Amino acid sequence: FNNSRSDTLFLGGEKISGDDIRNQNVLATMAVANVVKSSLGPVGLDKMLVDDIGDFTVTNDGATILSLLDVQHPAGKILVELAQQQDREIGDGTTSVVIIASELLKRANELVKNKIHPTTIITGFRVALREAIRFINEVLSTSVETLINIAKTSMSSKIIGADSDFFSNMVVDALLAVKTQNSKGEIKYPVKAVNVLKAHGKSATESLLVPGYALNCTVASQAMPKRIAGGNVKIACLDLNLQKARMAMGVQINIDDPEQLEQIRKREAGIVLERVKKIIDAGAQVVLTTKGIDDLCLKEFVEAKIMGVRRCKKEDLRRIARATGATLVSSMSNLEGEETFESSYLGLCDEVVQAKFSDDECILIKGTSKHSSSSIILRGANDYSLDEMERSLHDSLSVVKRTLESGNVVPGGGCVEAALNIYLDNFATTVGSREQLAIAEFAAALLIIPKTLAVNAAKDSSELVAKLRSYHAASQMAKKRRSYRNYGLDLIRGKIVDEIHAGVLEPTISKVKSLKSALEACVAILRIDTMITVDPE
Amino acid sequence: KDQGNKKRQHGLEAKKSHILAARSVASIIKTSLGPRGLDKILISPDGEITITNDGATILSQMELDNEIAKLLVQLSKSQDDEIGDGTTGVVVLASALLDQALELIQKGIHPIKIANGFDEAAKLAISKLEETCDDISASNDELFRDFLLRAAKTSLGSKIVSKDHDRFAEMAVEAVINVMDKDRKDVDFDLIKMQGRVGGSISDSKLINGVILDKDFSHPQMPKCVLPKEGSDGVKLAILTCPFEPPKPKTKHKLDISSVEEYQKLQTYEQDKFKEMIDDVKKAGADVVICQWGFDDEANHLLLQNDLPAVRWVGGQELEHIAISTNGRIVPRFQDLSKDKLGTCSRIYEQEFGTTKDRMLIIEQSKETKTVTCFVRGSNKMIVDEAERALHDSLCVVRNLVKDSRVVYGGGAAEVTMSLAVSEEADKQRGIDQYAFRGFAQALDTIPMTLAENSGLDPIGTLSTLKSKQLKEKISNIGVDCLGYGSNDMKELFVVDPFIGKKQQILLATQLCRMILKIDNVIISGKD
Amino acid sequence: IVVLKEGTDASQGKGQIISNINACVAVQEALKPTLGPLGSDILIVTSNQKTTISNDGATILKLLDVVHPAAKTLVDISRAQDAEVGDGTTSVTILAGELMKEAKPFLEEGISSHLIMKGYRKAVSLAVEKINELAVDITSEKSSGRELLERCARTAMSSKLIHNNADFFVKMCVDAVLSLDRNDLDDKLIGIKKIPGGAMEESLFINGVAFKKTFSYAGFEQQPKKFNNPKILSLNVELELKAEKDNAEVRVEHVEDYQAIVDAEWQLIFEKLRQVEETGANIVLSKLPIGDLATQFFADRNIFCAGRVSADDMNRVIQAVGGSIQSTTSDIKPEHLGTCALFEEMQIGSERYNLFQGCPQAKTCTLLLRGGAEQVIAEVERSLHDAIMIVKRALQNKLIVAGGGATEMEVSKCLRDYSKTIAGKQQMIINAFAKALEVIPRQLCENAGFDAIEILNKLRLAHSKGEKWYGVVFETENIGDNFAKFVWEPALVKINALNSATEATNLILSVDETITNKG
Numbered sequence A: 001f002n003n004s005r006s007d008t009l010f011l012g013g014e015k016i017s018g019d020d021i022r023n024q025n026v027l028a029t030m031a032v033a034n035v036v037k038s039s040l041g042p043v044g045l046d047k048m049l050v051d052d053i054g055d056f057t058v059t060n061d062g063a064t065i066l067s068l069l070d071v072q073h074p075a076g077k078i079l080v081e082l083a084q085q086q087d088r089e090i091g092d093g094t095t096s097v098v099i100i101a102s103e104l105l106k107r108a109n110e111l112v113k114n115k116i117h118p119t120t121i122i123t124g125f126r127v128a129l130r131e132a133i134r135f136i137n138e139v140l141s142t143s144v145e146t147l148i149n150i151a152k153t154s155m156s157s158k159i160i161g162a163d164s165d166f167f168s169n170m171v172v173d174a175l176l177a178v179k180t181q182n183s184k185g186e187i188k189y190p191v192k193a194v195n196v197l198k199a200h201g202k203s204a205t206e207s208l209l210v211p212g213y214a215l216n217c218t219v220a221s222q223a224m225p226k227r228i229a230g231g232n233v234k235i236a237c238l239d240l241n242l243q244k245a246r247m248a249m250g251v252q253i254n255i256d257d258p259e260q261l262e263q264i265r266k267r268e269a270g271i272v273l274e275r276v277k278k279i280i281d282a283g284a285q286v287v288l289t290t291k292g293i294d295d296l297c298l299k300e301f302v303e304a305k306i307m308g309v310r311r312c313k314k315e316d317l318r319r320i321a322r323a324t325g326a327t328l329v330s331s332m333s334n335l336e337g338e339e340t341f342e343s344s345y346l347g348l349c350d351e352v353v354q355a356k357f358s359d360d361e362c363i364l365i366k367g368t369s370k371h372s373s374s375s376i377i378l379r380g381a382n383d384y385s386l387d388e389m390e391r392s393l394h395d396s397l398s399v400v401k402r403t404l405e406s407g408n409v410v411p412g413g414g415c416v417e418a419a420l421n422i423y424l425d426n427f428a429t430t431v432g433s434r435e436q437l438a439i440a441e442f443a444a445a446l447l448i449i450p451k452t453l454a455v456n457a458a459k460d461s462s463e464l465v466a467k468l469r470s471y472h473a474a475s476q477m478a479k480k481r482r483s484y485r486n487y488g489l490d491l492i493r494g495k496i497v498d499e500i501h502a503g504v505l506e507p508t509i510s511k512v513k514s515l516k517s518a519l520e521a522c523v524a525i526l527r528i529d530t531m532i533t534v535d536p537e
Numbered sequence B: 001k002d003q004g005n006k007k008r009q010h011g012l013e014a015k016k017s018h019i020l021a022a023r024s025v026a027s028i029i030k031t032s033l034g035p036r037g038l039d040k041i042l043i044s045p046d047g048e049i050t051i052t053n054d055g056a057t058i059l060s061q062m063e064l065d066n067e068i069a070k071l072l073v074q075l076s077k078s079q080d081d082e083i084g085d086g087t088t089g090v091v092v093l094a095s096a097l098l099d100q101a102l103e104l105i106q107k108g109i110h111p112i113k114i115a116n117g118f119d120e121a122a123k124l125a126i127s128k129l130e131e132t133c134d135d136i137s138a139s140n141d142e143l144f145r146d147f148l149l150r151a152a153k154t155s156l157g158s159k160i161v162s163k164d165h166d167r168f169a170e171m172a173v174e175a176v177i178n179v180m181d182k183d184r185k186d187v188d189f190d191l192i193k194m195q196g197r198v199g200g201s202i203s204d205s206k207l208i209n210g211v212i213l214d215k216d217f218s219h220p221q222m223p224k225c226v227l228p229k230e231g232s233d234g235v236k237l238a239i240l241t242c243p244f245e246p247p248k249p250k251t252k253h254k255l256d257i258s259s260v261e262e263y264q265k266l267q268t269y270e271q272d273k274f275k276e277m278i279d280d281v282k283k284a285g286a287d288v289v290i291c292q293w294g295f296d297d298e299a300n301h302l303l304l305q306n307d308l309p310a311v312r313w314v315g316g317q318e319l320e321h322i323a324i325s326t327n328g329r330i331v332p333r334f335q336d337l338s339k340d341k342l343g344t345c346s347r348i349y350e351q352e353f354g355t356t357k358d359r360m361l362i363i364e365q366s367k368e369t370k371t372v373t374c375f376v377r378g379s380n381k382m383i384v385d386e387a388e389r390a391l392h393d394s395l396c397v398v399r400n401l402v403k404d405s406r407v408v409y410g411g412g413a414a415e416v417t418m419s420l421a422v423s424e425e426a427d428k429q430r431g432i433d434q435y436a437f438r439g440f441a442q443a444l445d446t447i448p449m450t451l452a453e454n455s456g457l458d459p460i461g462t463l464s465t466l467k468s469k470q471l472k473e474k475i476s477n478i479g480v481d482c483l484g485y486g487s488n489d490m491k492e493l494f495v496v497d498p499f500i501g502k503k504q505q506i507l508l509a510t511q512l513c514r515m516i517l518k519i520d521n522v523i524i525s526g527k528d
Numbered sequence C: 001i002v003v004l005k006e007g008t009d010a011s012q013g014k015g016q017i018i019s020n021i022n023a024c025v026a027v028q029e030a031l032k033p034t035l036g037p038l039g040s041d042i043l044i045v046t047s048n049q050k051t052t053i054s055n056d057g058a059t060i061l062k063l064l065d066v067v068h069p070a071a072k073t074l075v076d077i078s079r080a081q082d083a084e085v086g087d088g089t090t091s092v093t094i095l096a097g098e099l100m101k102e103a104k105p106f107l108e109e110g111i112s113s114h115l116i117m118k119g120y121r122k123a124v125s126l127a128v129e130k131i132n133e134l135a136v137d138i139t140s141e142k143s144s145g146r147e148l149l150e151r152c153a154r155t156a157m158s159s160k161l162i163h164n165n166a167d168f169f170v171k172m173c174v175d176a177v178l179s180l181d182r183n184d185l186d187d188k189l190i191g192i193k194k195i196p197g198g199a200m201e202e203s204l205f206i207n208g209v210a211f212k213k214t215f216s217y218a219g220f221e222q223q224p225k226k227f228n229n230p231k232i233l234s235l236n237v238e239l240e241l242k243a244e245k246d247n248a249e250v251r252v253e254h255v256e257d258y259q260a261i262v263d264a265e266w267q268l269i270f271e272k273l274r275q276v277e278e279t280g281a282n283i284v285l286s287k288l289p290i291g292d293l294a295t296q297f298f299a300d301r302n303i304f305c306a307g308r309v310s311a312d313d314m315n316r317v318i319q320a321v322g323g324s325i326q327s328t329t330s331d332i333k334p335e336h337l338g339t340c341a342l343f344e345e346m347q348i349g350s351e352r353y354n355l356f357q358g359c360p361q362a363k364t365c366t367l368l369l370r371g372g373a374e375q376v377i378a379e380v381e382r383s384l385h386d387a388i389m390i391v392k393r394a395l396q397n398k399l400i401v402a403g404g405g406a407t408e409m410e411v412s413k414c415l416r417d418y419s420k421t422i423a424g425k426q427q428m429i430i431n432a433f434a435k436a437l438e439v440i441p442r443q444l445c446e447n448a449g450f451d452a453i454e455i456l457n458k459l460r461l462a463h464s465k466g467e468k469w470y471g472v473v474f475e476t477e478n479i480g481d482n483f484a485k486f487v488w489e490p491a492l493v494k495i496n497a498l499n500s501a502t503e504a505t506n507l508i509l510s511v512d513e514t515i516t517n518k519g
């Protein structure tokens, strides 16, 4: 064993052809997939990934495990970039889009060893998908709480899941409250709002859901108030900085007469000081600049008990302002003047307070005019668990933004897989030929999710996998009696149940893209028959 | 195990490599196939310089690491072993075949299916030749001597020896007649001492009807030559394997000497004991002594006074040829002498050599003994050492002609008759075996073409002529004008190759192919 | 701060079992090409520097070194196959591996290995009986005594470098399994000899016995080199003056005693020497030397000899001319000697070869092999041992099965059909082994090029739908009755194969922790 030599065709690098490379690819994808096949399902578990300094992170987000795990090799990166696509597209389904991909190559490859051209296998998988995508719309349905359910089942393989009921609720709640219309209709749920925060202390359950937003800052000078308004407040969402001006980059102050020295000088303080006044003089009780504040132009807010926060997160102010109806003041101008325009640009908020959280202490803008908004704040044992709590609070809360934007769900629990399996499997004879083996493989291959969903329970999973297999195989006999697919796995107990009833819901939009995608990879790799690796520099 | 330092090859490349490697070994020796051929200076890693048109010898000397070449090394060798003349050619044909085989492969043919194709087309040619060949033994006696020679000659035209090819040929013809019998048809080459020394030119290479050996003739005073001793039946000579020294045990010794008594008897024991031998040989009535092991100062002197020229120390094969040459018996002890076990040779002289202080000796016989000694001479080592192997080549073609009086006319024509016949059967083949047969015959064409290339004739040209002519008339023998002369027709021209060999050759190549092709997997490791 | 093994690797887990499988697969896929009539061949240049080329799967798997515990069993079961049978070596591994391959799905899905082990266990039992059940015993059932050994040594000699010169070698092969007593077939008698050069078929079948030419002494060249009915003296020891070995001390105080003891030495030899002459022999052989003087003597009185004959040779010499080794020269009686039909000293391939050809009373032949390279002669000798050994085990068991995938394909049938009646875990496992057998037909087609998929699938119909000997028409690529086509192999192969192959397969499926020690 071991490929080598060259003889003719002098090439500045490595080059494997046929069997040799074609297997290498399959091995590659295989390994990168197998690392995260033990994180699949509720019975699946997280892992710790230590660096060189010794620090680490524990996480089940397949996409971050494959990101965090240094992968060197095309077909390896491919499935790490494909695991990426998911987390970037829908937001959950990563761990699974890879396990599928690997399974398609691994399998398809076997067919080639049997002497079956790659293309004939490719078209075969292509048709198995056409039929499979269509059929996927024959298990799904319109939203008919499906929400607190979607948000829950998406926390099974996660840390946040021991307290499913709690967060499953806080998730939908928080998201919903932020909805908007983008432009011309839409009604999209902010694919990123709800500033999430975390602080070590108290229970996992004691995670608060602010009734507004959580801007993470103090209050400039400790001299100003730490809590303002009980009834109504005017919030100044700025952007321009209130510090001592410096004039044009090319504006030399050339003095010819010692007179002008002192004058123009102290003027500098006032120029950006007037700007301060024209803002306090608007009813501004709360100021949120983005580009920081002077300590001089701060005392002005202090002397006036105006909660004024320095250099804020501009990604928050943009949302702190849509939430108090205010205006992100780029620079007081309008036509040709200068003012933050009394309450014209200001925002209406119920109350601005600086709540503490042991060690930390941040500001809260809870209750507002047009806010609707929310923001969650995790509390855990330490950063190690906390990063992950959120990590999967997101991989969960994302499943919701898509169930919403796309009113359509399918029963997970490895049901979808089983169904497609037996359907495509029987459908496989509708073309016979060599091509049969293709679709057949495709279908058969899908049973990876149900098998591995269960094997992650130690017990002889050949049980469920067999039952669930049979069921659908039967159900599609008058698919008539009382047709009952939607039968998934209940690993916690070890039996086949109706997941739609049980509460195991997953958005169609996931398993529809998770599938169309994973094959798009498998094919571009199925075509690989020679890998020329140039020598670097 | 040992995963590293271990490479693998398989078809895409592999086959190209091998095929090319063959081809390349070939490209070197192709310029040595022909009576217009050229030799190749090979140098031993120690520093030994050789120069030789001999196929086998060349490819043996090329210290080479390519596995496929290593195979062609033996291919030329094995043939040298079985015949003695193929060498230079067997490889050519083999390579051509491979290139051919390969060519087909890139058109979708199975390597192993080409193999069977070639083996088949081959067997056919072997036959189309086995039928067209001619016979010599069964035709005449004076003409057998001639034909047998007209082969030895043709067999030498591609050698430095060529210069004096008349003599070297008639020498090889003789050397074999004299040690093999028409019935047994067996030439044992132990009965032919191929000894060579330097001096003169290659022309002064004669044949000795006895043997040579190097000896100063025991005692200096001794005569230089040896007459047939007045009216006798030639010369008689002692052939003993017992040392002219006081006999000793072969188990122990310790001849305990109690007193002057016994030491007095030993005294006179060794003394006259030397007379006990010197007398013994005189009694058998001999002229000269040829003892396997040396003699003592005393015993030597006596051999002098008693006119008994002596030969101290003579090797196994040595003493033995002196027997078979002179018709004598190898006598153990001394008392086992006798006028009837002596050697009836015809003369003995101490041969001089330029000014070389060596100066060996010789034993003649006049009448064709059952031992010949081709004594080769040359202006310089290499000329000799080549001329000896050149002589050998012919001597072998003379042996093959008694073991199979069948002859085929070479000049390339012999290979054209196959290419012609084999190609005919191709059209009938059709399908896959059609490509094989075409190939086999096509590779063959390279043999004559190469001759044309070396003699300065347009290859495609001489081939079309050789093919047309050997068809428009009869699937006979029309060869290449390798040297010029009137025209083709190896017959007139007297170009002849023993059939028996030609078959072997056109087999050894196809078979070797048949092996290489079946190789689709390779695994080489290094020298840990 | 303490330890428990001193830095010495050792893996465990479920992956451990999977590693081992795949490991074996490698060593397996390696030989897959050397299968079938149109099978590829290998060229191994071991770290030794000795270059070899062959197909005896055993010989390949022996040159691969291989150190992986698991994958190293495939090397063992391949060796045994070249023992208890002599052929099929290539295949025992293809299957052995293939099963381990089909065990992956279960082992992965999360099934006990003890269950897969059981499943395969029955599968073999059933499959083994099925072969015994088809083992067409014959004798004159339109088969003849020679046409069985021929028809079987032939098909088995196929797919080897020795193929297109088949007829020549099968007629040669059978003739040499018969050369020895059919009551006790001992290979050690068919002693083979290799001669540098010549056509890979210009090989010679000596009727009596042939051996080297150890004749290393002066005075030869005399002694006829050919006799018709000579009186062979299969002597065992010495024939030198001073003796080749052993001694004592001779102490004498008398000058005469010295010359006395000398004359004694001589006479001591000569006597023993004439003692041989007295036996009235023409050929005097000895596993010990025959000194210059000795060989010189016989040379004088036209008696031929040879000293230091190969030990394993004199034994074949006896069995040829029917002599009988003798250690001393004294009690040499005449039923001790031997005589052939013809003796000659050849010059085959530029090497003199003493050979006692023609011996209608022999129980041991010898055969010289030829070739254009020390690799081909070598491959013949191994391509021929695989045949001779199959002819031999076809006398002792006139039970034969038609391979070419048929036997293999059929044993699948009954096994796959059986699994229907079982249902469940054992169903899939036993049904797997059934499919796993398809590797031989499968691979056999890919190697040659035939449509592996269609030819296989087309075979499954017809074979299961009747024709219990349908395999593959090597000729017109298509299925066919290999029994009718005469593709016979003793059942003794397949039965040993599936027994011994599975052994490996469960031996591996049984290991969960491999602890390699370092040092």
Ligand SMILES: Nc1ncnc2c1ncn2[C@@H]1O[C@H](COP(=O)(O)OP(=O)(O)O)[C@@H](O)[C@H]1O
Pocket: A039, A040, A041, A042, A044, A060, A061, A062, A092, A093, A094, A095, A096, A097, A153, A154, A156, A157, A158, A411, A412, A413, A414, A449, A453, A488, A489, A490, A491, A504, A506
């Ligand atoms: N409550 C459950 N019972 C059975 N299966 C579940 C349940 N919760 C999630 N699943 C299934 O587990 C898989 C998702 O788990 P996970 O390992 O988190 O994949 P991803 O990380 O890709 O979301 C899907 O098959 C989903 O249908």
Ligand SMILES: Nc1ncnc2c1ncn2[C@@H]1O[C@H](COP(=O)(O)OP(=O)(O)O)[C@@H](O)[C@H]1O
Pocket: B032, B033, B034, B035, B037, B053, B054, B055, B085, B086, B087, B088, B089, B090, B154, B155, B157, B158, B410, B411, B412, B451, B479, B480, B482, B483, B495, B497
């Ligand atoms: N005198 C010649 N005229 C025509 N052909 C000859 C002549 N001499 C040799 N040949 C051709 O060349 C062949 C011999 O080639 P040579 O260079 O001697 O190498 P080798 O004989 O070792 O193959 C002969 O068999 C014949 O085909």
Ligand SMILES: Nc1ncnc2c1ncn2[C@@H]1O[C@H](COP(=O)(O)OP(=O)(O)O)[C@@H](O)[C@H]1O
Pocket: C034, C035, C036, C037, C039, C055, C056, C057, C087, C088, C089, C090, C091, C092, C155, C156, C158, C159, C402, C403, C404, C405, C440, C444, C472, C474, C487, C489
């Ligand atoms: N003539 C043939 N036609 C079809 N199959 C054959 C033929 N000859 C041998 N076989 C089959 O080829 C396989 C033997 O392969 P081979 O390369 O001979 O290795 P081994 O015999 O050592 O396994 C067996 O299935 C045997 O039945």
Ligand code: BEF
Pocket: A060, A061, A062, A063, A092, A093, A094, A095, A096, A154, A157, A395
């Ligand atoms: F780990 Be997954 F993406 F929910």
Ligand code: BEF
Pocket: B032, B053, B054, B055, B056, B084, B085, B086, B087, B088, B155, B158, B393
């Ligand atoms: F050139 Be060859 F050896 F006669």
Ligand code: BEF
Pocket: C055, C056, C057, C086, C087, C088, C089, C090, C156, C386
């Ligand atoms: F390679 Be097997 F022994 F025929």
Ligand SMILES: [Mg+2]
Pocket: A092, A093, A153, A154, A155, A157, A395
């Ligand atoms: Mg999930």
Ligand SMILES: [Mg+2]
Pocket: B085, B154, B155, B156, B158, B393
């Ligand atoms: Mg020549």
Ligand SMILES: [Mg+2]
Pocket: C087, C088, C156, C157, C386
């Ligand atoms: Mg075989």
